[PDB]
Amino acid sequence: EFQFRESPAYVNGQLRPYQIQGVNWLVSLHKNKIAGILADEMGLGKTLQTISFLGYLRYIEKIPGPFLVIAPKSTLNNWLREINRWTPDVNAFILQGDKEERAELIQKKLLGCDFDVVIASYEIIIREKSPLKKINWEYIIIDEAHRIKNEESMLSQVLREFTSRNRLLITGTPLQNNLHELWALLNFLLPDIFSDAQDFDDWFSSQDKIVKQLHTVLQPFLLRRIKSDVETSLLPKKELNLYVGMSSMQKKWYKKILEKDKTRLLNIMMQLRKCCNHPYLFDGAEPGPPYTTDEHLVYNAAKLQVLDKLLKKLKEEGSRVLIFSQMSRLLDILEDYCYFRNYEYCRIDGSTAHEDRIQAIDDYNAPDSKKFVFLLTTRAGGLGINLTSADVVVLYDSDWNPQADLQAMDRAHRIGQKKQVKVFRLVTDNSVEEKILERATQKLRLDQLVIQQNR
Amino acid sequence: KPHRYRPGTVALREIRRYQKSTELLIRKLPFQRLVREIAQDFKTDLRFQSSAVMALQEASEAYLVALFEDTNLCAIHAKRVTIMPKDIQLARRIRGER
Amino acid sequence: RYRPGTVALREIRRYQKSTELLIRKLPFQRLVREIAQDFKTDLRFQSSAVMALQEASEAYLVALFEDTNLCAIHAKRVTIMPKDIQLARRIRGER
Amino acid sequence: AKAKTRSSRAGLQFPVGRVHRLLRKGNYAERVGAGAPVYLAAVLEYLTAEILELAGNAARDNKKTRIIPRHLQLAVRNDEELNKLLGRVTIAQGGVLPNIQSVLLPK
Amino acid sequence: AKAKTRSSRAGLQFPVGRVHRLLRKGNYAERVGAGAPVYLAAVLEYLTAEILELAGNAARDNKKTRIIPRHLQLAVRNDEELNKLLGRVTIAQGGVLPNIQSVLLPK
Amino acid sequence: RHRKVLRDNIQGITKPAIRRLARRGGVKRISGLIYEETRGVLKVFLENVIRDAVTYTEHAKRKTVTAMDVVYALKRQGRTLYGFGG
Amino acid sequence: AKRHRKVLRDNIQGITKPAIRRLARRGGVKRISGLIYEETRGVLKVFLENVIRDAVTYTEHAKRKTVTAMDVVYALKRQGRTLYGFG
Amino acid sequence: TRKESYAIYVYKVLKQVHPDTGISSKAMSIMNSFVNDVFERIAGEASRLAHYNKRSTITSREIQTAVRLLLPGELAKHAVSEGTKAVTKYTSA
Amino acid sequence: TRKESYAIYVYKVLKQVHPDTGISSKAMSIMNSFVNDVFERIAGEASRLAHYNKRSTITSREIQTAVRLLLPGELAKHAVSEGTKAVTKYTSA
DNA sequence: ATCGGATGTATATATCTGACACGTGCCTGGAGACTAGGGAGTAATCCCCTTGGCGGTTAAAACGCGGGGGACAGCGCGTACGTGCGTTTAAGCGGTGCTAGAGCTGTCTACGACCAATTGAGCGGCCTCGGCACCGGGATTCTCGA
DNA sequence: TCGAGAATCCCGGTGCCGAGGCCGCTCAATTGGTCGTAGACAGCTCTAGCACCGCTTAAACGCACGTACGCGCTGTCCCCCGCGTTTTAACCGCCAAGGGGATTACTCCCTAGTCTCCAGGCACGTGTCAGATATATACATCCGAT
Ligand SMILES: Nc1ncnc2c1ncn2[C@@H]1O[C@H](COP(=O)(O)OP(=O)(O)OP(=O)(O)O)[C@@H](O)[C@H]1O
Ligand SMILES: [Mg+2]
């Protein structure tokens, strides 16, 4: 069959050999009337491989057709700017904007069939589902396809109603929590082949009796390439855990929360995490009014206190920092801190508008890049984007899901980094943060020590 | 010149369209916040069923609508068309709850 | 002669100080018997039963007159009127 | 012999046996007669039929073929006996009767 | 052994045994606990003492040595908690509280 | 044996009696149309109470209406009356 | 400073003026004075306090820690306003 | 566990009254609450009637008197007719 | 036949409160009906509390909860204190 | 604005009187002691429902502005009502007779509780389709400036 | 006055979702005997409700007058409504955690039932004192001439 020996002719630029192998894998998958999970590690050109496969489908099999690309809201522009760069002949648009502009775009292009690729987000797929369901899609592509790890989610249910000739799933972290998530992803690709929750669960039941069976079962439907056996030029990450104490204010507030000391405290863990991040996240802690930002912020929070010294030292060495957080208000506190320290931040969060996200990414990635730090939230700004300019990643607080942090760190450890990437996870001593770190470590081991290791 | 309705026509239109419908007129989230804050003074750290909050909202809205009908009657009795705090107070006084 | 309203206030004070029954007993008893004969012919009544009925009726009427006075004062008047009584009963929910 | 429900014997649709049990386990009296459940079930069935007939008429007047709380509310509030019986009752999602005072209407 | 009333054991004036009998012969529940009559008797005694204190003060205010329904009415209606408790209650030969609206007084 | 209505007994609630009741209610000035309305209101109230009392009486298989029947009827209407038993 | 943007300065203020107007329109009211809104908020607060106090008493007696729709229904019935449609 | 209700009986009565109309879930819940409320009212009034008359048994005439006390006007007559007819039919068989 | 009243207990409480005050027969009858009314309210609330919670026993917990439900404000607190004191004194003896 | 004079109300005193507080005898209901059994408290389990914060979408809310119409004060004018007088009638009191009815007592006896075996009716779970909710587009109606 | 014009109503079309129908448990309702007691029935008694009559006198009724109040009209002003713009907070979906609620099994202890006293509460006289009644007096107050 077509083994595509060399770099695609129609594709501008030259792609590395493993990308050609991945494209060949996709072609073979297509011919054998099956669908797979392109699951290379975070940083390798999965998007380029998908675009090259689409270029093959349009130029060698002569099927321009309708193509659907579902991606997180922060990566729509990246998809557009790469389709227009590698195969600058495909008609592709983003179905985003107000419901008036969305209606205009639908009536003009979608219902006029004046398009080749429709890029959309997970929210616009559930919302503009009636016009989109009226198309016989040839390929339905889902970037960061671990969002459908739950089969009862409305996105999954809506997606199981479209008509599609074939499907493709892209994600760098296929296994999230347990094995049922993998079944939820596979039931979308091959609903007829698997179709079975209990059979899948009990054929496997979480030596060699099952793990090798895992490798044989997913062998035809999943392809993984690790960044160490493939790139061998990107330097590996040097991650460090900065254990910190607590401030007297933090000690007092932690004691008050644990000793049940009119405000409603129904989720103890979340309040303890808020205390460990910054005491000012609690209403009334900050001295005032009048409220001033002068210096009190930095010393009554141990994490911010360590961060100040590390950030100063890095600025002297001349590095640029990425700072991720689980909370958006803590990101406001960090905004105010960089205001007083006279830094140049480039915040993006879940409430940031589309064009604002585009502008922030380009400003931080622009040549000479006068911005110093990037403020992101691990959920909104922790997927797909390409902040390879920076070299230091600071994880201000850990997540219950270790993969949500792996994604965040790999926003700088990708193709075209040519630097040393240093990760500083900030952990608070003798708190709940150690508990979440332990649980995340166990969940990480569950999959990494077992299934994806041989890949 | 633009088109403006007389100062009392839109009001009748809203009266008709709101007496024809049956949905809840208060926003759910603010009402939930109010309920939890009020309840916090009797017992600390209570949980609430969604159906419980829904029942409270239904009862409260029915109560306020009936009170507004009584207030309207009092205002019309005073030969006005605007309702006033004195009208509300009189309605609650006659009902035996003040 | 006393000006209109002086004797009315004297009567208000007298009757809010006293506690006896303000309707004559024989007319009220005849009224009770006449009403009751439309439900069962040839009924008999205990004297205490008729007294209980009079007590309840007078309490009900006095409370109604208090509410009627409030409605009249709300309408910026000092004379009570049938519309005042009707409004009071409508608000109380007896209509 | 062949079991025959007491509802069938009395020509009813409501459960005479269930009503009898609910009377016994309700702490209403020490002893419960044989005809009390039959009487109570018949009365409950009559009241249910009355409300349902009025609500079905109200549903028909709106060109609908399913009774909803709005129709129940309209039926109850539009006749005096049921309005007096359910005088202090709130029907959830029922709304109100359309009623504008005459002095508010334009001249 | 000599007999001691449950009221004396609980330090009450109201009768615990009579309250127990009325509880278990009034169709309230299948069983009645031992402390329920004691609690109920104490509560009833407290309320009675409250009302009688207020009525005795009212009777003294009129230079009388016997409590009459007028004194009971004055006590109940002048005390706000008791007025809420007995809001729907009529006291025979009680009268009303003296209260004239200020708009009716001479100018 | 013998029973009839004599002299239209609702007019036995005279105008002075209604004025006395209004004075106890705190009313200073009375319109001349209050009396007929008051008589109608009193008749309706008495009709409801007496209907319930007679229902109790004839359930008890008696022919005499008792104060306890009246008290039960008032409690049913929601107007408890202290001082006549119960 | 973007840390200190604002709070809603009470939760009783979340019963907004348009919502009170909608309730008045369902009640049949045509004009509304400007002082009606504070009065309505006070009235609603009193009503809610009574009902919730009774419901929480029921919940504590049942030795539970979550208020249920049945508790709310019993509290309303006790206060004399029966609610149909919740149990 | 099992929750018993009056839903099937209400549906049977509905099919007798309007053979072609349906009913929604919320409406059925409201009907169930209505039936329970009326049952409780009648049973409570009958119970306290029996207590007043120093009886210990709740009988069909106690139920009849409770119905007369509770239902208004023309509802009482038709409800009493239905109850008497049912009791007669039952005792005959 | 005999008729049972609360008159002697009410008189004892009165002599405790005001040692030199009497009471007339009409006022005594009013107090008797007041005691019966409050008894009925509290016992009915306790009964339906036990029914709600699927208990078949009326205990001092039911009585205390019913008192809290029925009495307003300060009355409820003082009545609860009195009842608890009496139950403790009874149990200790 | 301020005295003079009627006028109605509260106060003190002496007098019955009938209603309340007291003392006596009985019986019935409460307390003590014992037994038996079943209701509820206790501990363990599990799984489900609540909580909290975020991400994106978007419709409602908040603010400002222009104007008209409704509330409120002032004035004048009948008219309806309050006050007082004289007359009569009917209510309240009392005393009497009577007889209908309500309550107590004793005796069955039919009816309701209890119990064990059994089966069928109701519930919970699982499926489809028809009724109802958007949705655009035309018709009709009503309002506001002429 | 009649011609714009904005809102509402049909009305056909589409989809989607919630109502209706079907299939296995399982538990609760039915059947058949067995008791025992709650209530129905007959008889008797006494009491209290009714009917009548006579007297008295206080309250109700009818009339007249004059005043003050309800009502209608006018004018003003201010405040609330209708409308447009922007953004912000609600809404819904997502994603974790874990606390709390519902179930089950076990046992013990607390309550009911029984029998036997016995003392406390009720009914019944009985004196006697708090209070209602009548009379005289002083005072606060209202209403009309200076
Ligand atoms: N053949 C190539 N030549 C040059 N650059 C490439 C090539 N392939 C990929 N890249 C670089 O990789 C970046 C694109 O990111 P990529 O498509 O690898 O994201 P991903 O790793 O697939 O997604 P995620 O990291 O979210 O899993 C681009 O900036 C591009 O410069
Ligand atoms: Mg990517």
Short mmCIF file of C-alpha atoms in Angstrom, two decimals, chain E residues 6 8-15 18-19 21-23 27-36 38-40 42-54 56-57 59-60 65-69 72 81-82 84-86 89 91-92, chain I residues 4-6 9-10 12-14 16-18 20-24 26-27 30-31 34-35 37-44 47 50 56-60 63-64 67 70-75 78-84 86-87 89-90 93:
data_model
loop_
_atom_site.label_atom_id
_atom_site.label_comp_id
_atom_site.label_asym_id
_atom_site.label_seq_id
_atom_site.Cartn_x
_atom_site.Cartn_y
_atom_site.Cartn_z
CA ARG E 6 -44.03 11.14 89.80
CA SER E 8 -43.11 14.97 93.46
CA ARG E 9 -40.19 12.98 92.09
CA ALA E 10 -39.86 15.55 89.31
CA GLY E 11 -40.50 18.53 91.59
CA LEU E 12 -43.66 19.69 89.81
CA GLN E 13 -47.16 20.83 90.73
CA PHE E 14 -48.92 19.53 87.61
CA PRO E 15 -49.80 15.81 87.59
CA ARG E 18 -52.66 12.16 84.58
CA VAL E 19 -50.65 13.60 81.69
CA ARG E 21 -52.72 8.65 80.90
CA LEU E 22 -54.00 11.40 78.61
CA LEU E 23 -51.03 10.91 76.30
CA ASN E 27 -54.24 8.25 70.03
CA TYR E 28 -50.96 10.11 69.70
CA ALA E 29 -48.53 7.24 69.23
CA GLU E 30 -48.31 3.53 69.85
CA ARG E 31 -45.95 4.00 72.82
CA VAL E 32 -45.12 6.82 75.23
CA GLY E 33 -41.72 7.29 76.81
CA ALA E 34 -41.14 7.69 80.53
CA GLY E 35 -39.79 11.24 80.30
CA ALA E 36 -42.40 12.60 77.92
CA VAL E 38 -42.52 14.84 82.88
CA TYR E 39 -41.37 17.19 80.13
CA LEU E 40 -44.92 18.06 79.08
CA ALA E 42 -43.09 20.97 83.29
CA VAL E 43 -43.83 22.96 80.13
CA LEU E 44 -47.52 23.32 80.98
CA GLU E 45 -46.67 24.42 84.51
CA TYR E 46 -44.25 27.03 83.17
CA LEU E 47 -46.81 28.53 80.79
CA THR E 48 -49.48 28.58 83.49
CA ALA E 49 -47.13 30.35 85.89
CA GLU E 50 -46.29 32.95 83.23
CA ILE E 51 -49.90 33.80 82.46
CA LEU E 52 -50.92 33.81 86.12
CA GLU E 53 -48.07 36.13 87.08
CA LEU E 54 -49.05 38.63 84.41
CA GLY E 56 -52.04 38.83 88.99
CA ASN E 57 -50.04 41.96 88.28
CA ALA E 59 -55.42 42.50 88.92
CA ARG E 60 -53.26 44.31 91.47
CA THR E 65 -57.59 40.53 94.82
CA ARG E 66 -59.28 38.12 92.40
CA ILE E 67 -58.25 37.43 88.83
CA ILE E 68 -61.07 37.80 86.31
CA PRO E 69 -61.26 37.23 82.53
CA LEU E 72 -56.39 37.50 81.81
CA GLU E 81 -45.08 36.46 73.12
CA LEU E 82 -48.37 35.36 74.64
CA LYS E 84 -48.56 35.65 69.34
CA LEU E 85 -49.29 32.32 71.04
CA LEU E 86 -52.98 33.15 71.56
CA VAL E 89 -58.10 32.81 70.58
CA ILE E 91 -61.39 34.99 75.79
CA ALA E 92 -64.99 35.24 76.97
CA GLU I 4 -61.64 15.94 85.72
CA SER I 5 -60.14 19.42 85.62
CA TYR I 6 -56.84 21.25 86.15
CA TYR I 9 -53.09 22.38 90.00
CA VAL I 10 -53.70 25.85 88.59
CA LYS I 12 -51.37 25.55 93.48
CA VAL I 13 -49.34 27.36 90.82
CA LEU I 14 -51.21 30.58 91.57
CA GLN I 16 -46.84 29.80 94.35
CA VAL I 17 -46.75 32.92 92.18
CA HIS I 18 -49.05 35.34 94.03
CA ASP I 20 -52.50 36.23 98.40
CA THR I 21 -54.47 36.41 95.13
CA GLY I 22 -57.68 34.54 94.36
CA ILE I 23 -59.37 33.55 91.13
CA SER I 24 -62.99 33.43 90.02
CA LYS I 26 -64.93 31.98 84.98
CA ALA I 27 -61.21 32.75 85.04
CA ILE I 30 -60.57 29.95 81.00
CA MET I 31 -57.27 28.70 82.42
CA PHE I 34 -56.01 27.14 77.98
CA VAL I 35 -54.15 24.19 79.49
CA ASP I 37 -55.58 23.69 74.25
CA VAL I 38 -51.82 23.89 74.75
CA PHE I 39 -51.69 20.20 75.65
CA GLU I 40 -53.50 19.31 72.44
CA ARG I 41 -51.25 21.46 70.27
CA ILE I 42 -48.01 20.09 71.70
CA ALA I 43 -49.17 16.48 71.68
CA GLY I 44 -50.43 16.70 68.10
CA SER I 47 -47.41 12.78 67.24
CA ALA I 50 -42.94 10.72 65.35
CA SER I 56 -43.70 4.57 67.12
CA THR I 57 -42.85 6.26 70.41
CA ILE I 58 -43.35 9.78 71.74
CA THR I 59 -40.29 10.77 73.74
CA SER I 60 -39.01 13.88 75.47
CA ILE I 63 -41.88 16.98 73.15
CA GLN I 64 -38.91 19.35 73.09
CA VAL I 67 -42.27 23.00 72.04
CA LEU I 70 -44.99 25.95 68.67
CA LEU I 71 -43.79 28.48 71.22
CA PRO I 72 -42.34 31.84 70.08
CA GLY I 73 -38.96 33.31 70.92
CA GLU I 74 -38.14 33.59 74.62
CA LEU I 75 -41.04 31.39 75.71
CA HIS I 78 -37.52 29.14 79.01
CA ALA I 79 -39.95 26.26 78.50
CA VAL I 80 -37.18 24.06 77.13
CA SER I 81 -35.05 24.91 80.16
CA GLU I 82 -37.90 24.05 82.53
CA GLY I 83 -38.61 20.73 80.85
CA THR I 84 -34.96 19.70 80.77
CA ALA I 86 -37.61 18.50 85.36
CA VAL I 87 -36.48 15.49 83.34
CA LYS I 89 -34.43 15.87 88.42
CA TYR I 90 -36.82 13.00 87.73
CA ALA I 93 -34.52 10.26 91.58
#
